[PDB]
Amino acid sequence: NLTHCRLFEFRLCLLECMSLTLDHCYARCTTVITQIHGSDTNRFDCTIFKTCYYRCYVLGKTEDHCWKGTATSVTGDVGDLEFC
Amino acid sequence: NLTHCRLFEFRLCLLECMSLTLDHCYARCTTVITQIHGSDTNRFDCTIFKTCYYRCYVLGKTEDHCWKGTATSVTGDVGDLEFC
């Protein structure tokens, strides 16, 4: 499960950070979320989910649909990096 | 470039954490390094390199070769995850 990843939170932080036109929002939110909730949010399978969603966005430039597709399909296993 | 990523530090922390037989060293090391140096170590390209290196390691379980192979051929572009 990706419960402890606090992924919805990262999504809101990411959208809000970019509304401020801050650089490297992906880094800032990971740091912010780590400082509050720690290692649970940096598990490699959280990283896989975030990379599927964030790659989709830098390339697809939707966010709305990139979250739908990731949250419904990507579970965090190492294999997901090449169909997501 | 990937200098701000402090990747060799992460590589040493992971090796140290694993030699102690602790679980979730990728998370713990990402976390401690975050608490110490911050968002520059969590930029999306650092995550690309870390994923190529760590994926090569869970699948093949070599480490030194996965490190050398990733260090020489991965620069952090979003397109690197196709051939790590």
Residue numbers in the entry:
A (entry chain A), B (entry chain B): 6 to 89
Cite, word for word, the article reporting this structure:
The venoms of marine cone snails constitute a particularly rich source of peptide toxins, known as conotoxins. Here, we identify the sequence of an unusually large conotoxin, Mu8.1, which defines a new class of conotoxins evolutionarily related to the well-known con-ikot-ikots and 2 additional conotoxin classes not previously described. The crystal structure of recombinant Mu8.1 displays a saposin-like fold and shows structural similarity with con-ikot-ikot. Functional studies demonstrate that Mu8.1 curtails calcium influx in defined classes of murine somatosensory dorsal root ganglion (DRG) neurons. When tested on a variety of recombinantly expressed voltage-gated ion channels, Mu8.1 displayed the highest potency against the R-type (Cav2.3) calcium channel.
To elucidate key structural features of the SLC superfamily, we determined crystal structures of Mu8.1 from 2 different crystal conditions referred to as Mu8.1_38 and 59 at resolutions of 2.33 Å and 2.1 Å, respectively. The asymmetric unit of Mu8.1_38 includes 2 molecules that form a single dimer with an interface equivalent to the one present in the 3 dimers in Mu8.1_59. Each protomer of the Mu8.1 structure comprises 2 regions. The first region comprises an N-terminal 310-helix (310N), followed by 2 α-helices (α1 and α2), and a 310-linker helix (310L). The second region comprises 2 α-helices (α3 and α4), and the C-terminal 310-helix (310C). The disulfide bonds are found primarily within each of these 2 regions. Within the first region, the Cys18-Cys34 and Cys22-Cys30 disulfide bonds connect α1 and α2. Further, the 310N-helix connects to α3 through the Cys10-Cys51 disulfide bond. In the second region, Cys61-Cys71 links α3 and α4, and Cys57-Cys89 tethers the C-terminus to α3. The dimer interface is characterized by both hydrophobicity as well as the presence of a water-filled cavity surrounded by the polar residues Thr36, Asn47, Thr52, and Thr56.
